[PDB]
């Protein structure tokens, strides 16, 4: 799944 900046703390 493509990395999305900030999706770890802040969701897709």
């Amino acid at each position, epitope marked *: 799944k493509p*990395i*999305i*900046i*900030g*999706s*770890h*703390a*802040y969701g897709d």
Partner: antibody
Amino acid sequence: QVQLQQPGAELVRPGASVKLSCKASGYTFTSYWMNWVKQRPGQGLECIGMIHPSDGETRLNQKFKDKATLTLDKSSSTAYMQLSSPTSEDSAVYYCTTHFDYWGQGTTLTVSS
Amino acid sequence: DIVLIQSPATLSVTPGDSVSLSCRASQRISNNLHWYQQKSHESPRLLIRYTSQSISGIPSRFSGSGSGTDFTLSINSVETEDFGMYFCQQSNSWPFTFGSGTKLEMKR
């Protein structure tokens, strides 16, 4: 909460390989990418590459193709970056970060004899 | 490979004044532009993601805007905790690359 833990400082002699560690806690280690980032003293930030612990998928900045190797100890939720034949040009702060939101505190690497 | 230019490298501002910082990309990057704050002795901290999306916990005085090639981070009413380095980063094309950074220092 999520923690990414890196030793503050590492000292390597020129030519000797060094392997930096990033230990992840507080979340599912296989659920997010792990990035490594280099920062020289007064200078900017360079992405070295990233690895996904689910399947080991990895994308490398080709500037570092012959310098950095990314690996994982899934059992301990630890990510590693190995720097081969270090030189004074590799002296820098090295950060791990998952999706550029949670950051380790960075390892200061010094290459010196 | 994509080059981001942050100009000028240093800005001086008095607390309470407003500021905007500039980031210009060597090629079009859609909305794939993020902003980071980095204080002395600290790792960077994501402030704005995808050009203008706010980050939970970041003061509402921070906002971002931009169009494909030219981007700005605005701070209305700089506060003492805002002084530090600001970087932009593009994630349109691998390798992801950062600008060289603009230091915000306190005018006195």
